[PDB]
Design a protein around this ligand. Structure first.
Ligand SMILES: CC(C)n1c2ccc([C@@H]3CCCCO3)cc2c2c3c(c4c(c21)CCc1nn(C)cc1-4)C(=O)N=C3
Length: 292
């Protein structure tokens, strides 16, 4: 009873809407507190379960509605994010590709604006600050694991449940901190590195990071000091923010709280930080289906 119990009989499964590291996610309708509502279902040890059930609501963390035991398996009922994962949401906005007529007429390269992209980044930083302050270590921060829920509020999903100052996970190379590629240990510091790549994904409207490069090249190239280049449509303040997230020394990277402050500053300025207008020779950052 450590969680809002739910009867498998009150779950109306619909369609498959995605798939995480473990299992498929299914959209469904359930009855909670006598009321019928939308939800995503994921088939999920004991300690982690309590960790999740205890977490506690936060507007930028996908929320647990209830769990259900069935055939020896535990099914989690999750708050529903109608808009889907951030990665596809970003790629669906590349109107120059999805609706060129619209793009030329409005002279825009995305249905989304600079502010919206900054909000997604701020939303995630807020959620990560909340999680890291409680010793949580995500381990797999990336656009694909961010959900765009009600009112387009970004929500963090698929975060690791093993709490502590650092966690070893024997076992996503393009999002991993150098110290994780070498040691398989994760900390909030390596979460910050990944957040930086997430920020780069946001600004590039879902481009594959290090497009054109093999994982192998990264292993040797990253330690040499190599890092993702600034997208031409990105302001320097935003790019510097990413660079801070990728400092070789983990303890030199900012905290999520500091990241959020820098983002809120940008959000407050009338200034535009991520250019989405169409300029003479515009092209999107590439998506390497060979790596995905
Ligand atoms: C593949 C990933 C991105 N996956 C998840 C992966 C992991 C979780 C867990 C639940 C327990 C707390 C930590 O995190 C939730 C989701 C998760 C959710 C939802 C979705 C997806 C999820 C992907 C496919 C999808 N399409 N649409 C329209 C919504 C979703 C959703 O609505 N509520 C939760």
């Amino acid at each position: 009873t450590i969680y809002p119990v739910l009867d498998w009989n009150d779950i109306k499964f619909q369609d498959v809407i995605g798939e995480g590291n473990f299992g498929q996610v299914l959209k469904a309708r359930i009855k909670k507190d006598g009321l019928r509502m939308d939800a995503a279902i994921k088939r999920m040890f004991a300690g982690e379960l309590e960790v999740l059930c205890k977490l506690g609501h936060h507007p930028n963390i996908i929320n647990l509605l209830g769990a259900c035991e069935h055939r020896g398996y535990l099914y989690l009922a999750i708050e529903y994010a109608p808009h889907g994962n951030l990665l596809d949401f970003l790629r669906k906005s590349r109107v120059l590709e999805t609706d060129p007529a619209f793009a030329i007429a409005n002279s825009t390269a995305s249905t989304l604006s600079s502010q919206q992209l900054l909000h997604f980044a701020a939303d995630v930083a807020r959620g990560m600050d909340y999680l890291s302050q409680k010793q949580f270590i995500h381990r797999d921060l990336a656009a694909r694991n961010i959900l765009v829920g009600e009112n387009y509020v970004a929500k963090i999903a698929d975060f690791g449940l093993s709490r502590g100052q650092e966690v070893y996970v024997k076992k996503p190379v393009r999002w991993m901190a150098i110290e994780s590629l070498n040691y398989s240990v994760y900390t909030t510091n390596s979460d910050v590195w990944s957040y930086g790549v997430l920020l780069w994904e946001i600004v590039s409207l879902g481009g594959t990071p290090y497009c054109g490069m093999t994982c192998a090249e990264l292993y040797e190239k990253l330690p040499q000091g190599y890092r993702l280049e600034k997208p031409l449509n990105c302001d320097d303040e935003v790019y510097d923010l990413m660079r801070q997230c990728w400092r070789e020394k983990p303890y030199e990277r900012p905290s999520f709280a500091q990241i959020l402050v820098s983002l809120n500053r940008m959000l407050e300025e009338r200034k535009t930080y991520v250019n989405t207008t169409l300029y003479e020779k515009f092209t999107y950052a590439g998506i390497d289906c060979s790596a995905e």
